[PDB]
Structure 1
């Protein structure tokens, strides 16, 4: 069934439609969704345009309110969810995330199905390509149908962030030093150009590009952040370097020298710690401007884990040795912890930091109730007088301990807090029992809970 050149798909005809069309875009929609109502005329307009051009690309729709099992099979949780199917492959459909206009749809489809590398007839077309992007890759092949040219085109179709070019013109080769077939990466930073060395395979090309597409040391700004964190490099190293520091250039050069050893593996970033715009990042690491310059390393693999060098000697050798020890699994994760106050236990409410949390909260002889708070949190400020009154009530209790920890400046391995205030109870035991308090934040509620042995 076809409505305005869009194929109407159901669980009964879906497999037939995927087998019939090499290039099929499928919209999973719901008739009550505002976004789907707005998309429908643009989706039909894009389908009509592709049909008028004689394109093999076809557009289709699935009503997820009637075809629930079919939508579930493709993990559809929102509407519209748009997925592109190539060669009838149902295992890896590509999600469409680009603009809502008919032209964005048509352009997205043509950009993915089109030529992996743009044919460059001359040196002016090649310069225009290199100037159009911060990084551009050009394949120099006398025969575009050669097996090396095909492996280059397979590497070109796997990379979307870098524009690719392909040339057979001898002038373009001669431009700078190319005598025979080869691949060249161009960039607007560092050496400006990298020549491919080795056998021309898809794997060797992608590994070479991955290693040389990133600049050595990057300045952290709101403009560079999306490029750094949009990237597949899940290991980063940050140098907080105040512009007021003595020998700024020399210390930055030591960081650059170390970075040469980890190209493509660890991304090197520096940031001005004196600037007010960079304050949130300093605060995220529990760092003060007086503690700068400092170096931190982070892994972004789902659980963001931080690492810090044992030595704060910021030489090219020490930065290289720290990176190697990290890669060797020889450095333990850094969990933030404030200095333990001299009077931490003097008050009815005990003060905890990362350093003493474990031996206090997990004391087998004590029933410890801990408030994990943030100093700026309004709801924590309102809870504070109730918590102080709870501490004052149980101050002389044989086994009950009331405690608090600033979770903005202290991180602990046993408990991870992402809302404030979070209240957790640690009953008197050596099996590390933890009971989360989800009741009303009243002195009455806390008493019932403590007196019930954490049950109520």
Structure 2
């Protein structure tokens, strides 16, 4: 195997050889273009040098997952900075989700080899705030349930479980009996507690209610229905709107994820324009589902407050919440003109004969007096601005593809192909659509 800066290089010819030879090997399925792999490679080399200079059998190795996609396809690797480790007989590698630096890897491998201990005179700081979410396990006999707690501690590698046997720590953390408390630095800081309810409790309390939309947080968001909020950071009462969003997030924590995104930054304007909102409403609330189909939902009440945003997720859970479309509704003076407009909003209740025109084409500009005269003579014929609205039944590559609307809602598509004159359409409408259609 090729060794560079004490890092084995695997190109499907030595990966199996390296894993069968080195029992304790750290795996990296990196990519040439990814900036995460670009930053990880010096850290990977530093950790490989730290392990190699020490007298330990563990080392590090990188695999180009782009050129070696079979390893990613067999294992199930879905990320480029993904770090894994294969020990004995086939087992799932430890999902490395901690800090990707060298000494962090050195501390992390000790957990996977088979909790952390610190002196109790750390001024009650190091044990609790060693990391962002650090759990301390309290037990007088570090048994029947203590061994179960230790097994749960060893179940998750990414959580730095604590060991406590000193008597003053039990009283200082105010526990009459043995228990598990999750500590954090963002939401509450303390959450006191089948063999799975403890893991569910830790995963539920570890989850932050609100997430600032950034590059770093983004892979964890889709890793786990993200109700967004295009709230400017410099908006009027940013704190109050954010507190209302937090109170909304307290109602729905795990099923619906709450993300607040600053609309002031131009890097988020692409996210703004993906939903269609060109910063029309600063406190606007949109829910996006990304399960194989991007369906951006529309809240029922645009009069939105803390309660409205709070129960909007319940409204979405009811299933009655409709998707959002950029289709304008019925115009103000539709009744005055003999030809009326049946928009995509009214394309089912009111939409008789429909047509799908476009103000783009100059031939449609020339036909506008002709279509005015046809409607003036026939004083229902519907023109539809499909550039702004959307057609659900069919698509129009050639936009004046006339679909003759039937009677009694037995929908059929028959293409009129006349000469675009003021008399041909009158002759088509003189037969009631029986002649000239299709």
Tell me how far 1:85 sits from its aligned partner: 0.9
Q: Deviations over 1:320-348 (max 9, x none)?
A: 43312323444344344456899999999
State how many pairs are aligned. 434
Measure, in 1, the Cα distance between the counterparts of 2:431 and 2:108: 61
**TM-score w.r.t. length of structure 2:** 0.58
Pick closer, same or farther for the CA change 1:28–1:161 going to 2, 3 Å. Answer: closer
The aligned counterpart of 1:379 is 363
Tell me how far 1:436 sits from its aligned partner: 19
> Gaps (5+ residues) in structure 1?
362-367, 396-400
- The answer as to whether partners of 2:98 and 2:158 remain within 8 angstroms in 1 is no
Q: Comparing 289-298 with 276-285, which one deviates more in the overlay? A: 276-285
- The answer as to whether partners of 1:238 and 1:296 remain within 8 angstroms in 2 is yes
- The answer as to whether partners of 1:255 and 1:315 remain within 8 angstroms in 2 is no
Q: Deviations over 1:52-99 (max 9, x none)?
A: 75545467899999999889855799999975213x354634587999
Higher strand share: 1
Tell me how far 1:217 sits from its aligned partner: 3.8
Measure, in 1, the Cα distance between the counterparts of 2:84 and 2:424: 50
Q: 1:227 aligned to 217, 220, 225, which one?
A: 220
SS at match of 1:122: coil
Measure, in 2, the Cα distance between the counterparts of 1:301 and 1:222: 21
- The answer as to whether partners of 2:403 and 2:412 remain within 8 angstroms in 1 is no
Measure, in 1, the Cα distance between the counterparts of 2:113 and 2:434: 60
The aligned counterpart of 1:31 is 32
SS at match of 2:66: coil
Tell me how far 1:313 sits from its aligned partner: 3.2
Pick closer, same or farther for the CA change 1:12–1:433 going to 2, 3 Å. Answer: farther
The aligned counterpart of 2:204 is 211
Q: Deviations over 1:88-130 (max 9, x none)?
A: 354634587999998787566446436xx21243162751243
Measure, in 2, the Cα distance between the counterparts of 1:103 and 1:438: 74
The aligned counterpart of 2:123 is 125
Measure, in 1, the Cα distance between the counterparts of 2:99 and 2:426: 55
Pick closer, same or farther for the CA change 1:95–1:194 going to 2, 3 Å. Answer: closer
Pick closer, same or farther for the CA change 1:311–1:64 going to 2, 3 Å. Answer: closer
Q: Deviations over 1:16-65 (max 9, x none)?
A: 98678753446899999999999999999977865775545467899999
Tell me how far 1:140 sits from its aligned partner: 0.9
- The answer as to whether partners of 1:377 and 1:420 remain within 8 angstroms in 2 is no
Tell me how far 1:295 sits from its aligned partner: 1.2
Tell me how far 1:359 sits from its aligned partner: 12
- The answer as to whether partners of 2:111 and 2:157 remain within 8 angstroms in 1 is no
- The answer as to whether partners of 1:122 and 1:171 remain within 8 angstroms in 2 is no
- The answer as to whether partners of 1:373 and 1:421 remain within 8 angstroms in 2 is yes
Measure, in 2, the Cα distance between the counterparts of 1:445 and 1:127: 86
Q: Comparing 350-359 with 269-278, which one deviates more in the overlay? A: 350-359
Measure, in 2, the Cα distance between the counterparts of 1:15 and 1:287: 51
**TM-score w.r.t. length of structure 1:** 0.56
The aligned counterpart of 1:330 is 320
Pick closer, same or farther for the CA change 1:324–1:4 going to 2, 3 Å. Answer: closer
Tell me how far 1:282 sits from its aligned partner: 2.7
Tell me how far 1:174 sits from its aligned partner: 1.5
SS at match of 1:130: coil
- The answer as to whether partners of 1:212 and 1:264 remain within 8 angstroms in 2 is no
- The answer as to whether partners of 1:212 and 1:263 remain within 8 angstroms in 2 is no
Tell me how far 1:451 sits from its aligned partner: 28
Measure, in 1, the Cα distance between the counterparts of 2:37 and 2:279: 49
Pick closer, same or farther for the CA change 1:140–1:378 going to 2, 3 Å. Answer: farther
- Structure with bigger gyration radius: 2
Root-mean-square deviation (CA), in Å?
8.3
- The answer as to whether partners of 2:96 and 2:158 remain within 8 angstroms in 1 is no
Pick closer, same or farther for the CA change 1:143–1:312 going to 2, 3 Å. Answer: same
- The answer as to whether partners of 2:132 and 2:185 remain within 8 angstroms in 1 is yes
